[model samples]
Target chain A: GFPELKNDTFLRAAWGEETDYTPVWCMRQAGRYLPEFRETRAAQDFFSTCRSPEACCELTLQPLRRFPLDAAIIFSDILVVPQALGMEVTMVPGKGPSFPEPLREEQDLERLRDPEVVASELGYVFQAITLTRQRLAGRVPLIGFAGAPWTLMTYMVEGGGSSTMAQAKRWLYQRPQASHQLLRILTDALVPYLVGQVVAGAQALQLFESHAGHLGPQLFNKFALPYIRDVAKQVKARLREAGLAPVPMIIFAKDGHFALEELAQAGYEVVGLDWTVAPKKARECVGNTVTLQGNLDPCALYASEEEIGQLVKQMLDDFGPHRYIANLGHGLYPDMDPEHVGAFVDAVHKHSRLLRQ
Target chain B: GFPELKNDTFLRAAWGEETDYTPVWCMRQAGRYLPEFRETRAAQDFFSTCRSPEACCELTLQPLRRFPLDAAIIFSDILVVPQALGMEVTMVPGKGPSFPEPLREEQDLERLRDPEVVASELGYVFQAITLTRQRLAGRVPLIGFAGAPWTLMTYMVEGGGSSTMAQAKRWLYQRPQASHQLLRILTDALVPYLVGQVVAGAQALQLFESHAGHLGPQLFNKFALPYIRDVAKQVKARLREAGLAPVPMIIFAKDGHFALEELAQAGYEVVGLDWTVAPKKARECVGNTVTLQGNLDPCALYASEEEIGQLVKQMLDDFGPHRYIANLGHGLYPDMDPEHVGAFVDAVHKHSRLLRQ
Candidate 1:
C-alpha cells in the first residue's frame, strides 16, 4: 500500500503549504474518552492489550473510526524504551508510573546499557511496530515516537513524576558529568531504536520533551538540546543513507518557553510549542526555516461548544495557515468529552478555508 | 520612628532611586527555617504558630538577627485572610496548605465574605503587625503582604496544590460568574486588610501572586489583572482617606510575563518581576515610571558561589542603580542550602557596589 494521505485535505493543511481544507488530529486521540475503547478494554487488562499486536492494532484503529483525523500515531507508550532497557516500568492504578527499583545513586547509572540489549533481546517491539504498520494498511500515516532524553531521564531518576523535579535537578546540577554519561548512552541507543521504527514502516517521528520546562536555560542547553539534535540528525541521516524518503521529524517540549530559538536551529523539520508561546512571537523566533505544530491551551475546551469554535478560530487565525500544524499545545486530559473533541476538529477544518483567503 | 535616613540606603534602593549597597532579603524570610520556630512546637504544630500573633512576631524577628539585610516583613501567611473568612486551613507536612473543605459546589462560595469579620474577629493580626513593627524598633522597616486574589483563588479552588491546575481552570470557565464572585469578595476584603497593615506600622506593601505564571494573556487579563488592580485602587484610596502615609506598593506577580505592561499602568508604584522575565526587557516594558524589583532566577544559586556572584554582577549591570531593586525572581525552595543562601546574599552585596560606579 502507498503512503499517500487517506484524507489529503487535512495533511496538506497540517504542513501548512496549501489546502482545500485543514487537517486536524488531537493528541492522545485513542485514549480514555472513547466509549468503544472503554468497552474493548473492559474485556481485557490494559498492558496486556498494549503488548499484543492484535489488541494494539485494534486500539490504534478505534480513534480514526470515530474522528475523521488525518494521522494515526501508533499505540505505544514513550516508556517502552526504558522498559526495553530493563528498567522495570509499570503503570499503577490511581498513581502514575512507578519504578520499584529506581536509579537513586551513582551506581544506578550502570543500568543504561540495557537498550542495546533490548534491541538484541526484545525484537518483539520492532515486530509489534511491523505488525501495527501492516495492520494499518496505509489508512493514514502511522506516526512513530520516542521520549526526548531529558523527559525519559526524569522518570528514570525520580522513580516517577515529580512536582518540583528536586531529585532530577539535584543530579543534573550537582552531578552533571554522571547525568551526561547516562544521557549519552541513552542517545546512542535511541538512534538505532528510532531507525528501526522507520525501517518498520512508520511514516513520521515525534520526540516528546515533556519535562524540558523544569530545567533552567543553562541546564537545558547542556542536557536536552544536544541529545535531541543528535537523535534527529542520526534519524534523518540514516533515512538518506538507506535510500528512503525522509519522513519529517517534529520535537515537542511542553512548557518549554525558554528554548524556542535553540529549537529552531535543532535538526528537526518541525518544533511543537506549548500554549504559553504566542503564535506571532513564535513565528518571529523560529522564522520560516522550521514548521510549528500545535499550541492551543487545551483547557480552553472547557468553554462552551460555541466557545470551542471561537477558540479554534483564534488558533487558526493566530497561526495563520501555512508552516504550522494544528494540534493542542499539550496532550488532551482524560475527562474531555469526545463530542467536544470532534467539534474542535470540525472548527479547525471549517475556519481554516476562511483563513487561507 | 522616622522615615528619614539613619539609613535611607535600603529604602532608597527598594524605591529604586539609588543605593551604594545592594538590598538583600529572602522571600518568606520570616518562616520555617529558624531554630526558635522549630523548637516552639511539636513538629505537627506549625499552623498554630503562624496563626498566633506573639508567635508570628517572634519568628519575624528571628531571621533579622541571623542576616543583616534590607527589611523585615510582617510575619503572616497570605492564606490567613481566607482562613479568617471561615475556611479550615491546615499545613499538611511537605504537601503545603490543605483546606479540609474546599470550595467546590456553588453552595461552597457562600462562606467567603468581606474583611469585616477579620477586622473584628481576627484583630490579633493587627496586634501581630504592631508587635513585629515594635520589635523591628527602627532597625528596619516592616513590609506587609497579602495574596493576590488569583493566587489565593488557585489554592482555594484546588483545595491545595495541584499537579496541573485543571480543576481550578474548569471552575473558572464552567462557572465564570461564581469565580468572579469569589474574586470580587477577595478584592473587597483585601482593601482594608492591607491598609490596616500600613496603619499598624508596615512601611510598605507587596502582593504575592505566586501562581501568576500558569495563565497566559486571555485568562490572566480577565481574572488576575483586574482583581489585582481592584485591590491596589481600594488600598490606595483607603490609605489616603485614613490620613496615613501612602506607602509604596510592589505588585509582585511571580511568573507574570504576560501582564507586565498592564501592571505598570495599574496603580502599582513598583512592579516585581519573577525570573521568567529577562530584567532588561522588563525595565523597557514598565519603564522608569514604576520602579522594578527582582528577577534573578533562584535556581541559579545551584551553581558555584563564584558563578552566582558573576550572575549577580551581570544582573546589576543590566538593571543599573536608579529605579531597580536587587532580589530573587521568586521564592526560594525549602531544599536550598543555608550556606548557598548566605553566599547569594554576600555576592549581591559585594558585587553590586561595582555597578554603582
Candidate 2:
C-alpha cells in the first residue's frame, strides 16, 4: 500500500536522480488546516465541499489519516482555475477570496476566454481528479496542482486579496500586450488543465506562482518565469506523446525571492521553497537541478518540543540528506496545535533519519 | 549639494571605508507616503511632527528637497521607545498604531521602570535628535533607529498591525519569563535611546527588525538573533564609552532568512538587505565583515526609466563590485515617482560611477 512509484524515492529525488530518503510534501497536503479537514467542511458549505467528487476524495484521505505521510495532494483550489474559466468564484467566511466579475478592462478579455467553453465549463475539475485518483487506490503519489498563469491572472484581475499588488502590478506594468493576451488565454487553459490531471490519475505536477514575489526582478524573468517555462515545456512535450514516464514537474514561485537564478533555468522538476528561502542559500543559488520542497516556518509549529527539535535539526542541517524535500515554510497556522503537527512530523522524520547517517 | 554621505559611495562601501561616490538612503526616508509628506502631515499632526524639534528638522529635510539623498533618518518613531516607557501611544489614521495600555500581565513590569519617568520622557527624542542635527549643518549623516525588541514586542502585544503574530507568538511561546521581561526592558531603554542619538548629532545606527521574518530557524537564533545581538552589543559598548568612531551599526532583520549566518555575528557594521535578499546569496551569507544594505524592490520605482536603469544594472551585477550599499527592499511606495526617486538616485549614481572603469 505504498505507491512508491517503481522505486520512487520521492520521484527520484525530484528527478535530479539521486536519493536516499528525503522527498517530503505538505504545501496544503489536503487543506482547511486539517482536523480531518475541519470534519470534512463541517457538513458542506464551501461550494458544497468544493463541488464534491466524493467530497474531494474524502478530503484527500483526510491528511493521510492524520500523518505518516509522504505524498498525496489532489484536493484542489487555485481559485479552481478561475472557477474553470467561468470566474465568479467565492468563499467569504470572514472575508477572503471573492470575485463576482473580476477582470477590469479590455472589455474583460472576451468573458475570460471562451475556448470552446472550458472543457464543458471545467467538467468539475476532471471529475475532481478522476475521483481523487480513484480514491488513491494506489495509496500515495498524486499531487496535481495549477494556478500559474501569472497567478491566475491576479485572481482573474484583482477581485480578491490584494495588499498593493497595485491592480495586478499596474496591469503588468502598463498593459504588456494586454497582459500577454491574458497570459495567452491562461496558457491555453493550463495545458488542458494540466493534461487533464495527467489523463485523470495525476502522479506529479504543481505550479502555484503565488505572486512570484511581486515582479521586476527583470520583470520576473519576463513576466512570470517565461510563462511558467512555456507551461513547463508544453507539459513535457505533452507528457512525451502520452506514453508517459516523466511527470515530476513542481514549481511553487510564491515570493520567488528574485527568481533564484531564473528559477534554476526554469524547466522545473521540483523547487517550491517559500519560507523566504535559505536551504544553504538554495544550495548556492539553485545549482543542484531541482528538488528542494520547502522551508519550515509554519510558525515553527508554535515552538517547544525542544523548539520543534531544534527546527528539525536546522532543516536537516540546511538542506542535506540528499536533494532535500522537507517542507512548510508557509502554511498551517490557525493557531496551530494539531498536536503541533505531530511534533512537527515527528521532528522531521526523526531528525531526517538521523542525518542520513 | 549632494550629501550622499560625503559623496556617499554607498556610505563609503559601508565602512570597510573608501568612496568617491555611492551612498543612498530610503527606508521610509521620512514618509507619510510623501506628497511632501502628505502636505506636511496635513499641516502638522502625527504627534506634532514627532514632538517638534523645529518640526523634527523640517521633516528631516523632506527627502533632501526631493532626492539626491545619502542619509538623514532622524525624525522619530519606533513606537517612540514605547512612548518613552509609559505607553499610552496614539496614531489612528486608517486604524494603525495604538497602545492605550498594552502589557497584560506580570503587573506590567511596574509601569515600565519609571526611573524618574523614563529620562524625562525621552527628552523630546533627544530634542528631536539635537534639533535634527543642528538643522543638518553638514547636510548629511543623521540616521538613528530602534525597534528590534522583537519588533517592539510586536506592536506592544498586538494592539495593532498584525495579521497574525498570534499575540506575539503567544508571548514567545507561553510567556518565557514574560518574553524575558520585554527583552530586558528594550535593552534598558535602548542604551539611552542610542546614546541619545549619538549625543544628538546622530551618525549611524539601524535595528528595525521588521517582524524579523516571523521567526523560524530555531526562533530566529533564539528570539530574533539574540535581541539583535543585544542591541548590537550594547550599541557598540556604548559607542566605545563615548570616545566614538564605533558609531556604525546596522542590523535590519526584515524577513531574516535563516539569520544570515548569525547576521555576521550581530554587533553590526552593516547588513540591511530585504529586497527579498539575493545579491549573490547575500555575499555568500554575510562574509567580508558585513556591509550590504538594501535590495531594490521598492516597486522597482514603478518600472520604466528604462526599467529603472535595468534594475540598477541588475543590482550592480548581483552585488559584486565592493561591499555594496544601494538601498530599498522595503519602503518608498506611495505611488512612487518623486521623479522616480530621482531616477532611483540616478541609477545608483549613473551605473555605479562607470563600474569604476
Candidate 3:
C-alpha cells in the first residue's frame, strides 16, 4: 500500500481511454531548468542525487508545485542500467556520461556480469521509485524509464557520449554475433529491471531509445527493434506473473522517425515521438491502436508564452484528443525558461479542455 | 570552355533519365581516409588547403585515381560562403569549425558585408572548380556545392558544430525576424556563388542542408525550406540570365525525413536522402517526378567487401535502377579504411550494372 491516485488522467490517457483534457508531462521535467532544482542539487555529483531517494522525490515533485501537469516521472538517468552491468559510468559537467573502459571487442563482453543479477543490484533505484511514489501521494502517476538496449550499448561500447558511435558500429558491422550477444544480455537485464520499477510503485514505464536515429531502418529492424519488443513483452509477462496490474509501457525513441510502423507493432501501449515528426504523419504511421505521447520541440519553450499557447493549440488540433499524452518531443534543455515551461503545460491543459468543449 | 564530357551518366541520372548503370559517387570522396589525400594535403591547415587550386585539384583527383567514381566534386568547404560574409572562422583539427565572433543578435547582423559582395570574394573556390574540371580530363562531371542557408546559419550563429543548435534556435524561436533576415542574406549570397561555379565549369550543384534535422516540419517549412527553395530558384534564374546551361541541382538534407514531400516540390532536380529513410517509402513520399540520390549507411563500409556488395544489391533493388544515383547517406568518417571505401564504390558500380542486366 501506497496512497490511491487522485489524478488518473495520465494513466487513462496512456490506455487510450476518454479524458476531459489531454494529460501533459515532459521528458526531464525534473531537470535543471528550475532555479530550485539547481539549488537543491547543489554541491552533489549527478549520481549522488540519483542514489538519494529523498532528493529524487523532491526533484520529481518540484514541477507539480509550479504547474498542473498530469504525471510525475521518477528522476533518474537511463545510463543507470549500464552502470549496473559492471561498467564504470561517470557524469562529466560539460562533457556528458563517461566510461573510461568501454566494451570495444567481442572479448570485452566477458567483463559483464550475469544479466539475471543486475536488476537486484539496482535496488537503490527501486528504493527511489517506492519513496517517490509514496511521497507523490497519487498527485499524478509516477513514470519509470530505462534506455533501450541499443542506446545503452552505445554508451557501454563507446565509453561515453559520442556524436558518432563509430566504435560500437564497428562491433555491429564486424562482429554482429557479439552485437547480438551483447544485445541479448541487455534485453535479459532490462526485463526484470523495468518490472522492478513497476513493482516499486512506478505506475508506468518508458523505454528511451535515444540513439534510434543513428541506425537506418535495416540496422534498426535487426539490432534495435527485437530487443525493444522483448523488453515490453517480457516485462508485461513478469508483471502478470507477479499478480500485479499491467501498467502502460511507452517506447520513446528519440529521432526514430523511420521505424514508427514497426514500433506501433512492438507491444508498447504508447509510442513517444521526438519533435521532428509531424503529428498527423506520426498518427498515420502509428495507426489508431496505440496512444501517442509527446512531440513539442523543446526549443519552442524559448518562444513567448503567447506563441507557446498557439503552438500547443495547433499541436492539439493535429493530434485530436483521444489516445494522447502531451509532452515535449525531447527533454527540456537546461537553458529553457521555467515560465515558458509553465506556459507550455498551462496551454496544453487549457487548449485540450477547449478541444473537448 | 571545359573539355568534352566522357561520361554523363551522373548528369543523366540526376535529370531522371535512364542510364546504363546507377552513377556512383560519395559525399566526401576526396577525404582523409585515402593515404594519398593526406600525403598530398600534408602540413597545410584545412582552409589553406582549400585556398590552393593545385592542392584542391590534386585532392579531387585522388579518389578518381583510386576508385572508378562517376562524379568528381570540387574539393572545397561549405563554410567558405560564411567566411566570405565577414565572420572569422577557424578549424581546430579535432574540434571542427569555430567562429570566434558568431552572429549572436540583431546587432551582429551589421557585422556581415552586403550579400552581393560575397561571391566575388569566394574566387578561390571558383578557381579550384575550373582547375579541377580542366585537370579531370572529362573523366567525370564536376560538382560544385554550398552550404544551404539554414545549415550555414547554424555554423554562423552557433560558431561551430553543435549537438544542439540552442543559441541559433533561440534566435529562431524568439527573434524570428532576425533569423529570416540572416537566412535571406545567405540565400542572396549563394545565388551568384553557384552561378559562378557553372561559369567556372561545374556540371552539377548541391546545397547541403546539413542541419535540417534540428527543425520540425513547422520550423523547417518557415525557416529552412523557403531559403532552400529560394537558393534553387534564384540560382537557376541567375544561371539562365548568364547564358550558362542550368546544371541539374541536388538538395541533400541530412536527417530531414519528414520534409521529403515538400522538398520534392522545392525545385531540385534530384532529392538526396540519408540512410534513415526507406527507399520505397521515400519514392512514395517524393513521388516519381524527381530523381532520387543517395542513401547507403556509411558504416556499411566497415563490413566485409562481400557484405558491402550484398547490401548494395539490396539497396539498388529497393531504389530500382531508374532515376537513381548511388551514394553514402552521409560523408565518410576519417577513420574508415580506404580499402572499404573502394569496396563501397566497386559494389555500387557492380550491383547497379547487374540490376540492368
Task: Output the number of the lDDT-best candidate.
Answer: 3
- lDDT per residue for candidate 2 within B1-357, as digits (tens), equals 212334334456667675545677888867766776777777776876787777777878888888778887877778878777877788867665888678866677677755235646777877888777666776677787878888888888776666457778777776778787787777767766776677666777788888876664656676767777877777677778887656788888876756777888776888887776677777887888778887887776777888778877879778856766788877776667777778888788778777766
Provide the overall lDDT of each model, using Cα atoms, as 2-decimal numbers.
0.77, 0.74, 0.92
Chain A TM-score of candidate 2 vs. true chain A: 0.33
Residue runs of model 1 more than 4 Å from their true location after superposition:
A1-4, A8-16, A39-49, A118-125, B1-5, B31-36, B41-44
* Candidate 3 lDDT over residue span A173-268, tens digit each: 999999999999999999999999999999999999999989889999999999999999999999999999989999999899899999999999
* Residue-pair clashes, model 1: 2
Per-prediction TM-score, chain A only?
0.94, 0.33, 0.98
Write down the worst ten-residue block by lDDT for model 3 chain B. Answer: B34-43
Expressed as tens digits, the lDDT of each residue in B1-357 for candidate 1 is 434325445566655666676787777665544455556544336667665778878878877777766777776778888887788898766767898788887789877665565655457777888888776667877788999998888888888877667778887778999989888877877887888888877888899887776777778889889999888888888888888768788899865766788899988888887765667778877878778888677677676777778878888777777787677877766566656667777877887876666
Candidate 1 has which clashing residue pairs, if any? Answer: A10-A23, B16-B323
Clashing residue pair totals per candidate (backbone < 3 A): 2, 8, 0
**lDDT, residue B265, candidate 1:** 93
In candidate 2, what fraction of native interface contacts survive?
0.19
Which candidate order results from sorting by TM-score in descending order? 3, 1, 2
